[PDB]
């Protein structure tokens, strides 16, 4: 968690998602709904399954190799053959351990960043029409029906339409005393 | 919270009640919603004969077939991409040894071809096609099918001088031996010489072997041994065998080549699946990048690592609810 | 793209640029102008060309080594010499592939972060005098000439001078109804 | 959309119409505004003789120069940092072989010095300075310039017993040989002995070679061969040559040392450029971290990788406009 | 300096701190104080000493190995033994250099991000009660005594209590002319 | 700037006036508040004998103790996990050599056990307990305690044909030798034969050594040498001794096992510490991941690297105050 969008301001995870990885949750006067962002999850899918593509498909065809098991004990050259084969295993053991360590850490940071930028992208769209609780939620001060919630969902929301209305509900509290 | 007023819009990430543990650069124990395994730790248990040709060693070993053992009589001019010799192999002919057994076995396996074309060597004043009582094919005395036990005729063993030019375009493989007699009385009986000597040479390399007379422990009711050498003749070269005595003459040459063939020691039964790797434990799936079933592999096998488990994180961190 | 400042909110690149890496574009009532930020590009240049310095210049002087080509077929000792040399090539092939992959990914994320922090630094300087359109482009509300943009361009801008002016254009829309 | 009251200020990055493809950990195909190449894939095509001294093998090989072959007569006491022997080298003197050719060739190459100081061996009652008809220098019969073909005088070959202790402070290199005659008549005519025997020993290691009489195929109109051994005498040691017969005696010692010299097989012509690496293909630039032109390298050469191309990202992602 | 919370908007360091890694400095009418955030430094400490745990404790027990020093000069097999041991040293030299380089860079980036998210977490709590000068400092416009300053320190701050007061001191400057 | 109406709250990070330099992927020189060293560059300067058992070679070498050298008379049936032989070891008995010294020394070190059980070989009509004037134990002539110098009795040397089959469940080690006489008169005086021959053969492998008569340089007032071979008898083989003469017969077998034992060359003052790694330079701490003191290590030692310094950042970037 190098960005902070996972296990940071977000308390838990939404087990009720089957249509994507990252989604939204809203409640209006006309009802409550849920939907996921296809663009965000698709980007993280490419940068995760792509690592599988790099790992799988290596060409390392090897046919004839030195003997690695010995039924006898001869001396010097037998020791050298065992030492070479063992050294190759030891070097590749560290290569495998290092590779999985870097891939796992990068994957965790990649999904962490992919949702931190979704929060930033959404907040940029809403402008000063809303705010944040510090738990990932917003407060769209305009009287938003189902249409405008979905309009934000596929990245189309004219803030100037609800601009003067939201300012009343954010700054003009109790008629400024 | 919820209200009869402006809005609430939260964002989330999916999770599962039961995740998988993985290892990262900073956390030796961290939960991930989905992880995969990278190292193969299991085998089908059966060697598979596709696509690489696989020849079962049967009851004997490669060098036993290289000499003409009756137990290997079914290996007459057979090729293979992998010779799976078995641990239950037993020598069932005249006792023999190779001073460079490791080098000879690896060389023949690399060629992966037992093609044999006999050549009529010009032995004069000697008894050819010699047999022995320690190798009974069809209940009759015989010897190695690829070797020629020369024995003195009429108690006379004239000195030999033979040649064999190479006119082909590949490295011929002449395999010959020297007979070490158990007792001095034996040395006179078959060879009629106090002490023999052997010289096999070409234009590039020469060899010379003096038999070592001496009694040796009895195996298969034979106190003597035969030590088997080999020589390689390139195109444009010429072989020359001098052979004062005690020569187990060759019969032909083996067509040496280079390819993708090798040898392996295994006991898994032969099956009929399709696999790109063969290991002594058995054929393994070829999808995982690493494996730890066996260090000795043939084909396009994954790399061998000491670690038995390596989990790769595919999903994000699993942070459940409740509790 | 682990920050999202490249191919993220910035839709497209600027092929009409030769004087720097990251820069500015602005249009006022007196005309449209362009100028680069020498500070931002220099930070990324040092942290990119430095990777070239680390790679180039390694001292690995080796003079006497085992035979690597053979006109003979010896057997045991010939196979071992080939196996050792081949193993060295195979291990170094993975080292080169892994190194170039990590360097390229880190370089791409490094330049991506450099624009993200330039946007963050610029936004901090402007305080609440302006906003963001969601495409990396701010909307300055002060009645500003060519003077301010150059002053912001080299990190010197007192928002207090234009503070009370930008407030009317941002919050006092249509006289709050 | 432009206006008259407020201002507008956007941020951007530079890009080029035609970028370069690179490979990252997550994208096998991604565009970068500028990329460099890490692996060298080309050579100048000519070896270069600076800064390391490079000696052209010419018409013969290193061991041929180690013996005094007339074809390598111009290598009289010459040193090198890299002996570039050519594939067209041909033996043009008395036939010979080395039982440990691989060990002897690598040992002499490592020293990289053919310094010779002849020593007066005390051979008595024998005809020294032996000549053969298979080594014609100046149209006259001769032999190896570093060897001494001892032959019986007045049909008598008295047994030798000589010694040569070491006073110097370096490992001397005595190179001697054993003459294998083709026929028994040749053995008696040259050496007047039914069967010779040789013993070359020091205080630390001993050697004993029994000549192997036997006819061998004719090369350069000579049916016999000479097998050449070598011995190392460290300071404080004393060499002892017994030599009952059949000895191709040494003449002096080669000053063996250790350094940065080696041998290489190549056919590229020698040039005059400055380069820090030499490969059989030719000298290569010494700036790229990796290379794939040739696995056999000398000097501070870059590492060898199988991949022919490796592009390193030097700029940001190239995302053009339009379209 | 990937994120920019170290050597970025923060000008200098604080040598006067022994109770933590990341801290606060505030000035009120009743006095000036300083205290560190134990939660932030502990998160980085676990991810800093954890790298030490991975490196230390590897099991690589080796007892019998080929000869590595030679008092004689043999030839072919002597050269092969030297080449194998030297190759193992060269490969492990690159593995150690690469590992220490990746660990150090990730360490610097980790501490850089750990304080960037502390700035983000603090700013989220303050809502619109304050602003930023672009150097990691805020202006809490509320008449904050010592109690509320420390209330923010241990993550408990209801902005609604000081909401209308902060808006007066931030937007109603000189009575909007 | 302070005031009397609002508040102010900034953020910061700790720093040190004097930091440590480290190396990262993008900065060859960068300051960090705290860093640690990863490579060990120093040792205690002395070997130590815990937890692995360590046996000091003393005044002789392992093979000298394998034969019964009076210098190593105190190594009678002693086991070890690491034989620390010294560079000052000097042979103090009958001169000897091993054709495969490297192979024999490594094999005995791997077993790590000098257990000896003498077997009563049935020598008939020969003088046993052959003594030499080149080895004084207690100011009296003697020989190797593990070897038996057979010498003809009453100027008669009957041929020998004896066996010793294996009943145990471990590989026996019969170490024998062949005596090379300096002069022909010495050959007749000791063995009463014109030329000897030796044959040591089992059911699996055979050997045959013919003594090489010849004068050799004098060391310790002895012009002759003994070359020592060895044979391994598996649980089921039968050793067979067959020689007309010149046999330095064995006295028993050395029990061979496999374990965590090896030899090492060192000159450090063996002490009483506890450490899991033993290098020739001394004992090193077993906590740092890498080390550069010595390439030769025994135990759970860290990995040798060329770099003498590797600093790991265990903190944050140190950007200080002032200036
Ligand atoms: C130099 O020294 C060497 C070493 O000592 C010496 O060589 C020994 O020579 C002696 C003779 O002088 C050899 O002994 C002979 O071996 C012959 C065969 O006997 C063995 O084989 C029998 C058959 O087994 C086969 O067949 C069965 C099925 O029938 C099958 O299951 C088996 O697997 C195998 O294929 C076997 O039955 C027999 O075992 C019997 O005897 C042993 C020993 O007593 C006992 O332990 C068993 O329980 C069982 O009773 C054995 O293994 C054969 O020629 C000969 O036997 C005949 O002669 C003797 C003597 O006259 C009679 O008593 C006997 O009834 C038979 O008529 C005899 O046993 C011995 O093997 C050699 N040793 C070695 C190590 O090689 C040299 O001679 C010496 N001199 C010189 C100059 O070199
Ligand atoms: C045991 O068996 C072995 C193996 O069989 C046997 O060894 C053979 O012995 C015979 C003789 O008994 C050898 O044959 C002799 O070779 C001698 C030289 O002939 C060769 O060299 C000629 C010269 O070439 C040189 O010079 C030219 C320039 O002039 C140059 O270009 C060359 O490169 C090179 O430097 C060459 O011309 C000649 O080639 C002719 O002959 C061959 C074969 O017929 C033919 O193919 C060619 O087209 C060409 O016509 C050849 O290569 C020489 O002593 C001798 O020739 C004389 O004697 C014969 C017989 O009396 C006369 O007919 C002839 O006119 C000459 O006077 C003869 O040719 C043979 O080479 C041996 N082979 C091997 C493999 O070793 C042993 O003798 C047997 N016995 C014992 C006890 O060991
Ligand atoms: C084939 O050729 C070879 C090579 O030439 C040849 O071998 C040489 O043979 C000669 C004899 O023919 C050998 O010389 C003999 O060596 C014997 C011993 O002398 C050596 O040892 C003495 C004792 O040293 C021991 O003890 C002391 C304590 O006392 C201790 O410190 C030592 O470490 C060691 O343990 C030593 O004193 C002596 O050194 C003296 O002499 C040398 C040489 O002159 C001189 O440099 C020294 O300063 C010192 O004075 C030496 O190292 C011994 O048998 C013999 O000595 C007796 O005979 C001669 C001649 O009759 C008398 O003059 C003398 O007084 C004694 O009675 C003689 O010295 C020589 O070592 C051989 N060399 C080699 C390299 O092997 C073969 O014989 C030839 N023939 C055949 C058929 O092979
Ligand atoms: C490689 O192959 C060659 C070819 O076979 C072998 O060479 C033969 O070697 C054998 C011995 O192994 C030779 O046979 C004997 O050679 C001798 C010839 O006598 C010479 O010297 C006397 C001196 O007085 C002269 O009179 C005579 O003319 C010869 O110059 C004699 O020892 C033998 O001859 C006697 O015995 C025979 C017994 O049958 C009688 O017939 C004779 O009349 C005479 O009494 C005998 O001939 C043979 O000659 C060699 N052949 C050739 C062509 O040279 C090599 O030995 C072989 N090498 C190896 C290493 O295997
Ligand atoms: C290393 O070098 C040494 C030194 O040269 C060699 O030793 C010589 O070996 C040769 C044989 O190769 C010896 O020469 C012969 O030695 C014998 C000596 O006879 C002994 O036995 C008889 C028994 O009746 C005694 O009467 C006599 O005194 C001796 O004790 C004889 O076979 C020969 O002598 C006969 O023939 C010659 C022929 O010329 C006649 O002059 C003689 O009068 C006599 O009839 C012959 O002398 C030689 O003696 C050895 N030299 C020494 C100094 O010992 C090694 O062989 C050599 N080793 C190797 C491995 O190369
Ligand atoms: C010892 O072995 C040789 C060969 O090494 C034996 O030669 C054999 O001779 C017979 C003669 O009848 C050959 O049989 C014939 O072969 C062909 C078909 O293969 C054809 O002409 C006839 O139909 C007949 O079958 C036989 O092939 C040949 N063996 C080999 C391997 O070619 C020889 O008889 C044996 N004995 C002696 C004393 O040499
Ligand atoms: C974004 O998604 C919402 C629904 O998730 C879309 O809203 C619908 O818009 C259509 C016209 O395009 C109306 O007829 C429907 O009544 C709307 N549905 C609801 C539930 O309000 C919206 O159009 C989407 N926008 C785009 C550009 O795809
Ligand atoms: C940033 O650059 C701008 C110009 O791009 C500088 O503004 C100039 O300031 C000087 C005095 O320093 C005036 O005489 C010019 O008239 C200004 N030019 C314009 C176009 O307004 C500004 O000073 C620079 N700031 C710094 C800190 O160097
Ligand atoms: C956060 O820390 C501050 C002090 O740094 C705490 O404030 C104290 O609160 C107690 C009651 O809990 C009062 O009696 C003290 O007078 C307060 N101290 C000061 C200096 O104002 C505050 O309670 C802490 N908050 C939490 C949630 O633990
Ligand atoms: C309050 O909620 C009721 C339904 O319970 C709804 O009809 C009404 O419009 C809501 N009032 C406001 C002001 O949103
Ligand atoms: C409109 O633009 C003119 C110049 O074309 C300028 O003088 C005037 O001030 C601008 N008016 C406003 C309201 O921005
Ligand atoms: C550049 O890219 C274009 C496509 O954008 C391609 O058609 C063209 O061949 C490339 N090269 C040049 C030199 O224009």
* Atom of ligand 10 at shortest range from CA of B5: 14
Cα–Cα distances in angstroms (integers) from residue D245 to residues A2, D209, D215, E161, F210, in the given order = 84, 11, 19, 116, 19
Structural domains in chain F plus CATH codes: 54-265 (3.90.209.20)
Report the relative pairing of strands E31-36 and E22-28 from DSSP bridges.
antiparallel
CA terminus-to-terminus distance, chain E? 44
Q: Is the CB of B76 under 6 A from ligand 6?
A: no
Alpha-carbon span C38 to C20, nearest angstrom: 7
Helix (H, G, I), strand (E, B) or coil at F259: coil
Q: Which ligand is nearest to the CA of B7?
A: 10
Tokens of F59: 């005044």
DSSP single-letter state for residue B156: B
Cα–Cα–Cα angle for C175, C176, D3, rounded to 5 degrees: 60
Report chain F residues whose CB lies below 8 A from the CB of C108: none
Alpha-carbon span E85 to E90, nearest angstrom: 9
- The alpha carbon of residue D42 is apart from the nearest alpha carbon of chain A, in Å, by 24
Angle between helices C38-55 and C76-126 (to 10 degrees): 170
Helix (H, G, I), strand (E, B) or coil at D54: strand
Q: Do E62 and F9 touch (CB under 8 A)?
A: no
Q: How many CB atoms lie under 10 A from the CB of residue E156? A: 10
Which residues fall within 8 angstroms of residue E147, CB to CB, at 6 or more apart? none
Q: Do C76 and B106 touch (CB under 8 A)?
A: yes
Q: Phi then psi for F241, rounded to 5 degrees? A: -95, 130
The sign one gets for the Cα dihedral B44, B50, B51, B52 is positive
Q: Do F106 and A76 touch (CB under 8 A)?
A: yes
Q: Do C119 and D11 touch (CB under 8 A)?
A: yes
Place of tokens 């444009």: B236
Q: Which ligand is nearest to the CA of B2?
A: 10
Q: Which ligand is nearest to the CA of A24?
A: 7
Give CA torsion, residues F35, F36, F38, F43, to 10 deg. 150
Which residues fall within 8 angstroms of residue C131, CB to CB, at 6 or more apart? A127, A128, C138, C139, C170
For an interface test with B, which of D95, D97, D101, D214 has the most B Cβ atoms less than 10 Å from its Cβ?
Answer: D214
Q: Do D216 and B238 touch (CB under 8 A)?
A: no
- The alpha carbon of residue A163 is apart from the nearest alpha carbon of chain E, in Å, by 17
Alpha-carbon span C72 to C58, nearest angstrom: 35
Q: Phi then psi for D206, rounded to 5 degrees? A: -125, 150
Q: Is A50 on the interface with B (CB under 8 A)?
A: no
Q: Give the residue from F309, A7, D65 showing the smallest Cα distance to B33.
A: A7
- The alpha carbon of residue C124 is apart from the nearest alpha carbon of chain E, in Å, by 5
Q: Give the residue from F49, F93, F46 showing the smallest Cα distance to F67.
A: F93
Spell out which residues line ligand 1, taking CB within 6 angstroms.
Answer: B 183, 215, 217-218; F 161, 163, 238, 240
Which residues fall within 8 angstroms of residue C65, CB to CB, at 6 or more apart? D262, D296, E79, E83
Q: Are A13 and B322 in contact (CB under 8 A)?
A: no
Q: Is the CB of B133 under 6 A from ligand 6?
A: no
Q: Do B213 and F206 touch (CB under 8 A)?
A: no
Alpha-carbon span B86 to B69, nearest angstrom: 16
Q: Is the CB of F215 under 6 A from ligand 5?
A: yes
Which residues fall within 8 angstroms of residue D230, CB to CB, at 6 or more apart? D104, D173, D174, D175, D176
Number of CB pairs < 8 Å for D and E?
A: 18
Which technique was used to obtain these atomic coordinates?
Answer: cryo-EM
Place of tokens 């560079």: F87
Q: Which helix (H) or strand (E) holds A123?
A: helix A76-126
Q: Is B256 on the interface with C (CB under 8 A)?
A: yes
- The alpha carbon of residue B7 is apart from the nearest alpha carbon of chain F, in Å, by 32
Spell out which residues line ligand 7, taking CB within 6 angstroms.
Answer: A 146-147, 150-151, 153-154, 156
CA of B159 to the centre of ligand 4 (A): 9
Alpha-carbon span A92 to B306, nearest angstrom: 9
Which B residues 5-34 touch E at CB under 8 Å? Answer: 25-28
Cα–Cα distances in angstroms (integers) from residue D56 to residues D61, D161, D278, D281, in the given order = 10, 40, 13, 15
Rounded to an integer, what is the distance from CA A80 to the centroid of its chain?
Answer: 48
Alpha-carbon span E47 to D50, nearest angstrom: 52
Cα–Cα–Cα angle for C133, C39, C138, rounded to 5 degrees: 10
Place of tokens 């050498």: B229
CA of B230 to the centre of ligand 2 (A): 27
DSSP single-letter state for residue F79: B
Which residues fall within 8 angstroms of residue B232, CB to CB, at 6 or more apart? B171, B172, B173, B174, B256, C73
Q: Do C4 and A84 touch (CB under 8 A)?
A: no
Tokens of B153: 């005729």
Alpha-carbon span F182 to B267, nearest angstrom: 54
Q: Is the CB of B319 under 6 A from ligand 2?
A: no
Report chain B residues whose CB lies below 8 A from the CB of D217: 163, 201-203, 238, 240
Tokens of D173: 């290199």
CA of D193 to the centre of ligand 2 (A): 28
Q: Do B100 and C75 touch (CB under 8 A)?
A: yes
Report chain F residues whose CB lies below 8 A from the CB of C53: 28
Which residues fall within 8 angstroms of residue A86, CB to CB, at 6 or more apart? none
Q: Give the residue from F293, D135, C74, A3 showing the smallest Cα distance to B13.
A: A3
- The alpha carbon of residue B163 is apart from the nearest alpha carbon of chain D, in Å, by 9
Angle between helices A76-126 and A38-55 (to 10 degrees): 170
Cα–Cα distances in angstroms (integers) from residue B221 to residues A29, B89, B134, B218, B310, in the given order = 104, 19, 7, 6, 56
DSSP single-letter state for residue B138: T
Q: Is D98 on the interface with C (CB under 8 A)?
A: no
Q: With left for phi above 0 and alpha for psi between -120 and 50, is residue B57 left, alpha or beta? A: alpha
Cα–Cα distances in angstroms (integers) from residue C17 to residues C11, C22, D255, F52, in the given order = 16, 9, 67, 70
Q: Whose CA is nearest to atom 1 of ligand 11?
A: D4
Q: Give the residue from E101, E119, E94 showing the smallest Cα distance to E40.
A: E119
Q: Give the residue from C81, C79, C77, C87 showing the smallest Cα distance to C67.
A: C81
Q: Which helix (H) or strand (E) holds E45?
A: helix E38-55
DSSP H helical ranges for chain C: 38-55, 76-126, 146-153, 163-170
Contacts 24+ apart (CB under 8 A), E35-38: E35/E150, E35/E153, E37/E118, E37/E153
Q: Give the residue from D54, D37, D109 showing the smallest Cα distance to D275.
A: D54
Q: Which ligand is nearest to the CA of C154?
A: 8
Q: Are F288 and F297 in contact (CB under 8 A)?
A: no
Number of CB pairs < 8 Å for E and F?
A: 212
Tokens of F254: 């050395």
Name the residue of B154, B155, B159 whose CB sits within 8 Å of the most ligand 4 atoms, as the mutation to test its pocket.
B159
Q: Is E107 on the interface with B (CB under 8 A)?
A: no
Alpha-carbon span E147 to D90, nearest angstrom: 98
Which residues fall within 8 angstroms of residue D158, CB to CB, at 6 or more apart? D124, D125, D126
Paired strand residues for B241: B162, B200
Alpha-carbon span B46 to D307, nearest angstrom: 35
Tokens of E16: 């006067």
Q: What is the DSSP track for D147-166?
A: EEE-EEBTTB-PPP-EEEE-
DSSP single-letter state for residue B219: B
Helix (H, G, I), strand (E, B) or coil at B211: coil
Alpha-carbon span D1 to D6, nearest angstrom: 12
Q: Encode F262-323 in three state secondary structure.
A: EEEECCCCCECCCCCEEECCEECCCCCCEECCCCCCEECCCEECCCCCCEEECCCECCCCCC
Q: Are F153 and F147 in contact (CB under 8 A)?
A: no
- The alpha carbon of residue E91 is apart from the nearest alpha carbon of chain D, in Å, by 11
Cα–Cα distances in angstroms (integers) from residue B208 to residues B178, B219, D230, in the given order = 10, 27, 20
* Atom of ligand 5 at shortest range from CA of D243: 61
What was the resolution (in A) of this experimentally determined structure? 3.5
Q: Are B57 and B86 in contact (CB under 8 A)?
A: yes
Place of tokens 């906003």: C131
Place of tokens 């293909």: D281
Which residues fall within 8 angstroms of residue C78, CB to CB, at 6 or more apart? C70, C72
Tokens of F54: 């360590």
Structural domains in chain E plus CATH codes: 33-44+74-175 (3.90.20.10)
Cα–Cα distances in angstroms (integers) from residue D37 to residues D296, D309, D310, F26, in the given order = 22, 7, 6, 19
């Amino acid at each position: 968690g190098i960005f902070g969008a996972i296990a940071g301001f977000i308390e838990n995870g939404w087990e009720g998602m089957v249509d994507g990885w990252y989604g939204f949750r809203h409640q209006n006067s006309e009802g409550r709904g849920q939907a996921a962002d296809l663009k965000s999850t698709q980007a993280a899918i490419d940068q995760i399954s792509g690592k599988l593509n790099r790992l799988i498909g290596k060409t390392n065809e090897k046919f004839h190799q030195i003997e690695k098991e010995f039924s006898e004990v001869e001396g010097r050259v037998q020791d050298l053959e065992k030492y070479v084969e063992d050294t190759k295993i030891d070097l590749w053991s560290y290569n495998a351990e290092l590779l999985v360590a870097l891939e796992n850490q990068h994957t965790i940071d990649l999904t962490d960043s992919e949702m931190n930028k979704l929060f930033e992208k959404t907040k940029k769209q809403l402008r000063e029409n809303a705010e944040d609780m510090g738990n990932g939620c917003f407060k769209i001060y305009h009287k938003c029906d189902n249409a405008c919630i979905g309009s934000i969902r596929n990245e189309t929301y004219d803030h100037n339409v609800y601009r003067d209305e939201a300012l009343n509900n954010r700054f003009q509290i109790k008629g400024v005393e | 919270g919820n209200d009869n007023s402006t809005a609430t819009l939260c964002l989330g990430h999916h999770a599962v009640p039961n995740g998988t543990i993985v290892k990262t650069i900073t956390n030796d124990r961290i939960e991930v919603t989905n992880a995969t395994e990278l190292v193969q730790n299991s085998s089908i248990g059966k060697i598979c004969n596709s696509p690489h040709q696989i020849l079962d060693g049967g009851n004997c070993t490669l060098i036993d077939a290289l000499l003409g053992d009756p137990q290997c009589d079914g290996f007459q001019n057979k090729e293979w991409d992998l010779f799976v010799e078995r641990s239950r192999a037993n020598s069932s002919c005249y006792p023999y040894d190779v001073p460079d057994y490791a080098s000879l076995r690896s060389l023949v396996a690399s060629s992966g071809t037992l093609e044999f074309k006999d050549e009529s060597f010009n032995w004069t004043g000697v008894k050819q096609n010699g047999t022995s009582s320690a190798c009974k094919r069809g209940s009759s005395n015989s010897f190695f099918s690829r070797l020629n036990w020369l024995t003195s005729l009429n108690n006379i063993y004239p000195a030999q001088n033979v040649t064999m030019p190479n006119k082909e375009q590949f490295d011929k493989l002449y395999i010959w031996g020297v007979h070490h007699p158990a007792t001095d009385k034996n040395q006179f009986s078959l060879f009629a010489q106090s002490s023999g000597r052997i010289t096999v040479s070409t234009k590039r390399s020469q060899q010379a072997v003096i038999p070592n007379i001496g009694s040796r422990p009895r195996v298969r009711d034979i106190p003597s041994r035969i030590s088997i050498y080999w020589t390689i003749v390139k195109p444009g070269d010429i072989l020359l065998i001098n052979s004062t005595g005690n020569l187990i003459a060759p019969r032909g040459y083996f067509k040496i080549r280079s390819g993708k063939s090798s040898i392996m020691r295994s006991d898994a039964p032969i099956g009929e699946c399709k696999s790109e790797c063969i290991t002594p434990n058995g054929s393994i799936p070829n999808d995982k990048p690493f494996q730890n079933v066996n260090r000795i592999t043939y084909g396009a096998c994954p790399r061998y690592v000491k670690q038995s488990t390596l989990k790769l994180a595919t999903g994000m961190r699993n942070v459940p609810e409740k509790q």
